[model samples]
Target chain A: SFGTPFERVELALDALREGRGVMVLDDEDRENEGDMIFPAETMTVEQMALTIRHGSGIVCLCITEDRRKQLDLPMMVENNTSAYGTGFTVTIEAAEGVTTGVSAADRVTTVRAAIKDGAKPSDLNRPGHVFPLRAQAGGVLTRGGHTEATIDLMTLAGFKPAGVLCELTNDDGTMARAPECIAFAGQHNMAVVTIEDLVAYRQAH
Target chain B: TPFERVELALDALREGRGVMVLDENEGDMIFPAETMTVEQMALTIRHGSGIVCLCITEDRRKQLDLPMMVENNTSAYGTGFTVTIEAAEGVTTGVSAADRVTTVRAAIKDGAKPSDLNRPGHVFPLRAQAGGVLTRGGHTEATIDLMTLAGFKPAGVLCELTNDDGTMARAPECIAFAGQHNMAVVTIEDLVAYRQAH
Candidate 1:
């Protein structure tokens, strides 16, 4: 489209600028071409407007398509995500510079004990989820594959675990069903906890 | 018994006059530049392997007293570097760097009073290219965008509205357009250029 368009515009511009010049241009189908080329003195205002509008429309559409593709990613990442929670909020706090996880088991144990001891619903207001905890620099939590009961504790002692919320959904987004737990509680899938919870817990702790 | 010679060399340092190079081939010894010296040059080295050329009274092996280096264990490099300072230049209402003292002083020296400096209106130009979101009392209450433009990130934005206008003017809820030309304003162009540059 651009190749022929460029040729037509160039010829038209040359004829108009070079005084009384005539140039040939291909119309709709180059093979079944119609006469579009005009002498400089004979070009009408309507014809010029038509050519300019066509070029501008094509340029605008191309720009629109490029921006549409560029802005699509964040929306996709945000919308197509799954929640990882049973609607239980988890809160954790550690001193500045203190490690949260000594091992996987330690993290699991602390979470389990906190829940069992009836860590108030307000304490974990979000839901069961896994998040990275680093409110004070060296705090963090690690998760790979382990149940809340059987996780290693030593690795957790060095880094604290942040609160996590899981986002879950069916294969189709329209269906309302139990969300898949991406971390600890449900099936480990495609969800993680939020950073806000970690910061909040750190502040509270 | 063994004797050692230590040459102190100090050259090209900010305030350094010389430096110390130990005759390690001799007895254990340290020649701090503050304590020892050579004949002429206060402190200068001829080569990478600085030739001390020390004529020790005796020859004995010596060791330099250098502290052992240990790596800090744990994570973040900026872990202990976060600082929250309040009103460094007490003359100003908000927090600012110590460097602003010169500007503040210059203003005062030019017949500006401390009270005049403290007041936002006197300090900030009136009917300038930008105006503060004036509170009912007409004070420059800090806003997020204002703070950012002033080279600071405020934790929040605050505004106050009163029915004192008498016309029962609506609450200040309308979006303020900086110019009639929607996107052609200098500030808007600056933002667009910034985004493109980034």
Candidate 2:
């Protein structure tokens, strides 16, 4: 276990910059869950498969509002009813060159298509796969949730500011928290930190 | 009402909205290269009624598989035109706005390969000259400049907005279209001056 929150965050930042996965745990009351995150631009088929296989949640792409407009991804609803009021965009997949839209390779292509320059709304197919969450501009400073945290981490890591995140899950069809998620991180040698760490880091910077 | 200046258009563009580009009294609907949407592309084709082309750096063209066919340097502005391309995978017919967008997206992919494209497809690729708008000052170069100025990927999709008579829309027409669509309008002259000043 890490001695301090900052140390964990530092390790997580390093791993994220190196295109590795990191764990981010939300507040105990809000979500009470841990999510795995990586920069979307650095996402690989293997990482996507790991997320799909282990995380067992919607493979979401967290991008800025500007990026969402650029990608022409409109909100799935005017009012959100999700637990965190998470805003969801129409699901998408690579419009060309991807098959089935659910395969890890397909998902990677879809996410890549969403953020790359010369990306067009036409490059993606809606109602397909890959949920895009429009990250708040202030990031963790504005929202203390997984979406904002992932965006903040991606920004710190000098990536495209789009992050791919998924909820960590247990084999028993249950959500995993710090205890299980930390073990998961240890098994993978991934740096795990908390949302509070991210907030503090952003505040310090 | 539409934007009367480049800064407003630049802001609109940075926010992912399409803008009308009026260069040398001619009109083109331009969108951030990385985020060209299906609706924008479709509207440009339907209402703007122009040739749908993508403007990118010469380096990007070279990196991709653009060939110097059709005798380069012959057209107006010597636009540095390249072979057309469509995404080799995940498209239907490649002419629909969605398919064309897919082509541009594939072209911009990190470590994008030439083989990811098929020749003579729907979307045409135009390369901006060195110095962008400050040099040739063509719509091709201006769009590239506007995108960069707005903090987007250094690329843009441009479709010439033509009149009902199939004539390229002039300044008056360009201004009219911008108001009709609520898209900000920017001029090549303004872009060149901005580049010079900055």
Model 2, span B1-198: residue lDDT tens: 222477888888987787887754567889976887876666665554324678888888888857643341322234455655667777643545566678789988778888787664556677888898777878788888888878887888987665543345677978888888788877787777777776
**Candidate 2: TM-score?**
0.51
RMSD values, in order shown:
34.1, 20.5
Full-model lDDT for every candidate: 0.19, 0.73
Candidate 2: tens digits of C-alpha lDDT, residues A22-104: 88888887777788888888878877767665664356899899988987876654433233557666557687776545556
Per-residue accuracy of model 1 over A51-170 as CA lDDT, tens digit each: 222111000000111222222211111111112110111112121222222112222333333323323322221111111111222232322111110111111212122121111112
Over the full model, what C-alpha lDDT does candidate 1 score relative to the true structure? 0.19
Residue B137, model 1, lDDT:
13
Please report how far candidate 1 places residue B110 from its true position, in Å: 40
Off by over 4 Å in 2: B1-198
Off by over 4 Å in 1: A1-113, A117-120, A123-205, B1-149, B152-198
